[PDB]
Design a protein around this ligand. Structure first.
Ligand SMILES: *[C@@H]1O[C@H](CO)[C@@H](O)[C@H](O)[C@H]1NC(C)=O
Ligand SMILES: *[C@@H]1O[C@H](CO)[C@@H](O)[C@H](O)[C@H]1NC(C)=O
Ligand SMILES: *[C@@H]1O[C@H](CO)[C@@H](O)[C@H](O)[C@H]1NC(C)=O
Lengths: 51, 509
């Protein structure tokens, strides 16, 4: 509901960038299941996530 | 996906021939201009031939618009250490009568030093004086010639890559797809050539945005650990000692060794001190984490948030809050290319299936169109308000495209034509309105923002009062009457309640 979530199985997440239809974000913490949100209601419709 | 901002600048500008027997083309030359688009859109370039009914397009994909800098110079500074040795000899002849060098002899190598090696590197053939006596090594009171040689080494082999730059011009990425089928990517700059491939020379233009505190910054990166840091670096070979800018060399593959013929150092980079036939050397070279204003991978100097964008040819980026830049239009030039045209288009007819999306907003309104034909891809949709072109496949399939509408109830009649055949379509659906999203904590901008539509900012009386009354060309009056009666009844009830409250407050004090 808040945003997208990245799942890593090989090792920890050092740094990564995600892309959306008309917005982009970047965050890193160092855990396996990290959450990345863009804004409140910024993704309304049909979009493709390109991480 | 969808497409917009058609140009059609050089239609009917061919001088071809029979074309290999049935239908071919030779070359197309001209010049067009692509306006600015939002990150994550497609700009199509539809060509038009006088003989062929339709042709293919050229889509331009943009993903991110980062604030990078140019490349003024490139060099590699390896890590150095402190190494030195000496030797004790006696005069015993007329070679060390008064002084070691008679007038200009700098070759301090008496066929015994280890300077003739490949791992030695850079050094300075120096000499000093010694003492005389039995404890000093000789048996005659005379100044003894004692030579000393120091150099630098690199046991580990850490190599750094520094690239000074002081421009910081806007740039973006372009995923260009040729009409033939080849898809390649490249990183154009603001006014810098983009390594033209098969005639296409699409370039990006910026607005020359000023910087707050970006005066002396570089993009020094690490190779082994892939560690990045922002710190003021040096300039070209003519440099000063005291900051970054230590012993450099030619290239990275030649940076593992500190040998001469490519490695450059000015003077006074290693000290020498001796008391009694010792010739000890101390270290003065500072590491990368020693100068002032040394930042790290996450940098928030000023309004810019310098992150580390995973991308080729550059690992420095940054994105402030929504800027809404003025213009980011492109410029495309052609020199020579080959394209094939069918000119065998047959009967094709499609229809509209679904319709949804926002109001005149960022993402737009996506409309699904279904077609059926034998040709691979020959279609060109043209209608009022907005024009959208797309590609289809052989047979019957489903496609989704987006258009720009300026009305809540989209009920019009557009014209659709695939190749040479034309038909009519109709759209009917309900749309909504989405404004610019608001900022929330924990989220940071990544690349940039293009623009947000905030022109009207006024409620429309037509769309308003829709669910209040109801539908119908004659049911509207009944709904208005019912709403008015209900409002009057509730107003009388509220007035009675207020009168009762005032009566209760007045008495029984
Ligand atoms: C570090 O940055 C500050 C502010 O920009 C400047 O005053 C100072 O001279 C810089 N230090 C060096 C060593 O350049
Ligand atoms: C059209 O109908 C609904 C309307 O949104 C949509 O979910 C559906 O996927 C569309 N039909 C097809 C065949 O895609
Ligand atoms: C149409 O597409 C099919 C499959 O993608 C391909 O085999 C065929 O050569 C194409 N025809 C033309 C004229 O490009």
């Amino acid at each position: 509901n808040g945003g997208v979530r990245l799942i890593t199985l090989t090792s920890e997440l050092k740094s990564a960038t995600v892309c959306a239809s008309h917005f982009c974000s970047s965050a890193t913490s160092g855990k396996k299941s990290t959450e990345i949100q863009f804004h409140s209601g910024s993704l309304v419709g049909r979009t493709a996530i390109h991480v | 996906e969808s497409c917009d901002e058609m140009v059609h600048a050089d239609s009917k500008l061919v001088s071809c021939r029979q074309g290999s027997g049935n239908m071919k083309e030779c070359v197309t030359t001209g010049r067009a201009l692509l306006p600015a688009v939002n990150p994550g859109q497609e700009a199509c370039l539809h060509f038009t031939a006088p003989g062929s009914p339709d042709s293919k397009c050229l889509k331009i994909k943009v993903k991110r618009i980062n604030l990078k800098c140019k490349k003024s110079s490139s060099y590699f500074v390896p890590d150095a250490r402190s190494r030195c040795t000496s030797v004790r000899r006696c005069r015993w002849a007329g070679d060390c009568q008064s002084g070691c060098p008679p007038h200009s002899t700098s070759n301090s190598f008496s066929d015994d030093w280890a300077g003739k090696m490949d791992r030695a590197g850079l050094g300075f053939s120096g000499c000093s004086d010694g003492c005389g006596g039995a404890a000093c090594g000789c048996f005659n009171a005379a100044p003894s010639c004692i030579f000393w040689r120091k150099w630098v080494e690199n046991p580990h082999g850490i190599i750094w890559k520094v690239s000074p730059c002081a421009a910081w011009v806007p740039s973006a990425v372009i995923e260009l797809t040729m009409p033939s089928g080849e898809v390649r990517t490249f990183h154009p700059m603001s006014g810098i050539p983009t390594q033209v491939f098969k005639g296409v020379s699409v370039t990006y233009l910026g607005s020359d945005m000023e910087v707050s505190g970006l005066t002396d910054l570089c993009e020094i990166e690490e190779l082994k650990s892939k560690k990045l840091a922002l710190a003021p670096c040096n300039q070209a070979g003519m440099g000063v000692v005291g900051k970054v800018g230590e012993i450099q060399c030619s290239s990275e593959e030649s940076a593992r060794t500190i040998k001469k013929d490519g490695c450059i150092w000015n003077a006074d980079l290693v000290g020498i001190e001796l008391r009694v036939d010792d010739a000890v050397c101390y270290s003065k070279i500072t590491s990368v984490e020693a100068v002032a204003n040394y930042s790290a991978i996450p940098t928030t100097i000023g309004g810019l948030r310098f992150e580390r964008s995973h991308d080729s040819l550059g690992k420095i980026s940054g994105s402030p809050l929504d800027i809404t830049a003025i213009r980011g239009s492109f410029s495309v030039n052609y020199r020579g290319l080959r394209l094939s045209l069918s000119e065998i288009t047959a009967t094709c007819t499609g229809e509209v299936t679904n319709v949804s999306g926002c109001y005149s907003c960022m993402t737009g309104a996506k409309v699904s169109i279904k077609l059926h034909s034998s040709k691979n891809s020959t279609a060109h949709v043209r209608c009022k308000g907005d024009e959208t072109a797309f590609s289809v496949l052989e047979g019957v399939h489903s496609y989704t495209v987006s258009l720009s509408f300026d009305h809540a109830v989209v009920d019009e009649q557009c014209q659709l034509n695939c190749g040479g055949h034309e038909s009519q379509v109709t759209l009917k659906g309900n749309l909504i309105f989405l404004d610019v999203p608001k900022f929330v904590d924990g989220s940071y901008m990544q690349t940039y923002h293009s623009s947000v539509p905030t022109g009207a900012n006024i409620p429309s009386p037509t769309d308003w009062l829709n669910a209040l009354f109801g539908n119908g060309l004659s049911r509207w009056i009944l709904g208005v009457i019912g709403v008015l009666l209900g409002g009057l009844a509730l107003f009388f009830l509220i007035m009675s309640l207020f009168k009762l409250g005032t009566k209760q407050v007045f008495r029984s004090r």
